[PDB]
Amino acid sequence: MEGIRRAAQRAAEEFLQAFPMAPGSLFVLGGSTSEVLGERRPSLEAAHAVLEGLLPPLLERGVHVAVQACEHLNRALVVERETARAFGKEEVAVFPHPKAGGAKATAAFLRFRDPVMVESLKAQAHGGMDIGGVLIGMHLRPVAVPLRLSVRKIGEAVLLAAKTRPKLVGGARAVYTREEMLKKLEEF
Amino acid sequence: MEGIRRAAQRAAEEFLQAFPMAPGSLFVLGGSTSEVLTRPSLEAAHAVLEGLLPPLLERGVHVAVQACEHLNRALVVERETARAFGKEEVAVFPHPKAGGAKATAAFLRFRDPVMVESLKAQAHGGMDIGGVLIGMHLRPVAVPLRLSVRKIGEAVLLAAKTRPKLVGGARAVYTREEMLKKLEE
Amino acid sequence: MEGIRRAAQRAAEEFLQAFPMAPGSLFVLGGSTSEVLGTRPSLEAAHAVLEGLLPPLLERGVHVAVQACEHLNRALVVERETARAFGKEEVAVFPHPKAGGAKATAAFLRFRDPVMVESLKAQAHGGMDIGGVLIGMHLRPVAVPLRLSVRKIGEAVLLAAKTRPKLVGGARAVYTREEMLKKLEEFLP
Ligand SMILES: [Zn+2]
Ligand SMILES: [Zn+2]
């Protein structure tokens, strides 16, 4: 599953290269292991390979990671106790398993230190990835911006990565860069 | 009056046995001294507080005391509690005939008390002495606790803790074991 | 111009006298420099207003937000540390006089690490509105207008407001520690 493992690390590095997530920000991972393995039921092997490759890069930058479980658990997420506390998350009571929750949330639950399940992130993630068309947008804060990365797939699953950036505001006379602001000042 | 305190201490004792509230959590007390004895009693308020407060405070649990409905159930908390929990302070001073004896006894005993609008449903547990209701202050899901002490004085005691919502459909599981058993398959 | 900074300085001192804001509190400034002048904006008039109002607030550890005009949806300039302390949402834009006003632009130029934020989520404890631009949307309940001796800044009318807790309770309630102790006598032996 090395390529799953390898492709995972790559995307995480590419992502952070394009979106240098600061310490304390929050990252959300959603994905389907059945999709990662294609048409050949979930896979724990694949699950651990994805995490194996994806998590270190983010953890090294002190970025908090959340792993969304599937719809049978309402998409509650596996997070470290400290992340729930740092982000004011509401804990919900359930324990994931491949058949009820999925292999990726289950493997995350086993690999974390003091995992807890949370109802949602209250849409506070700053960036994240969707592996396999499971959807992760509900977890991201405005404004989500899809990121085209060179790594287009993790196994056979289509990879969708998104960063977030602030809303663009103000009317026809407004500007959006410091450079343009300075020109309006010279003109003034 | 010492018996009211003794029932209060046994209640607090049983309550924390079943729900060992951690440092930093919030307990809400609501109650009517009139029901413990329609005239409030500061004496009865002192006994209930002496019985309830020490075991909570020694655990680092924050305490809120709900005033009656004439002050719209605004509660008494230490200024630090209002700060840790992002509570909104309102302007009023309680007295037994408008606030009730217990909010009054708390306001006088607290180091730096403020009246707050509500706790924004943040409490992890509490007690209702006399059926005055405290549910609106508790975070989901409130689980009432059976304690041997069913009354304080002549007032019924309702005690409750809180716990996370149970979620997931028919295949979901709820204990680490059940999970393992599921992995082994 | 010095006349404008002096009226700003008097406004400030008097305001903080009537409402001694604590460190960590939040003050909101809104205004039209064109109104101060008595048309187009002026960075000089902005400069005079900020030099008069900001040193006394900052020395008390009060966080300051400066409201841009409606072309920028009244987003506000605040230090990044303030956006963070008050859980504010950063918005993407750069004010300039013609779009945002001179006051907000001067704040942005002067702050150390400025960011624009969408609103203050009505968390401000007090502020000033110079010229009738409105700042009430930024104040937490209950806003209380203060009458300062300083009524204008330049030609702009000055409106200053503090905030205080909602007064609650029915007919039997009391509102001072004094009234409370008296009510307790009457109950106690
Ligand atoms: Zn100057
Ligand atoms: Zn200066």
Curated annotation (Swiss-Prot), chain A:
It comes from the Bacteria. Belongs to the UPF0340 family. This is UPF0340 protein TT_C0214.
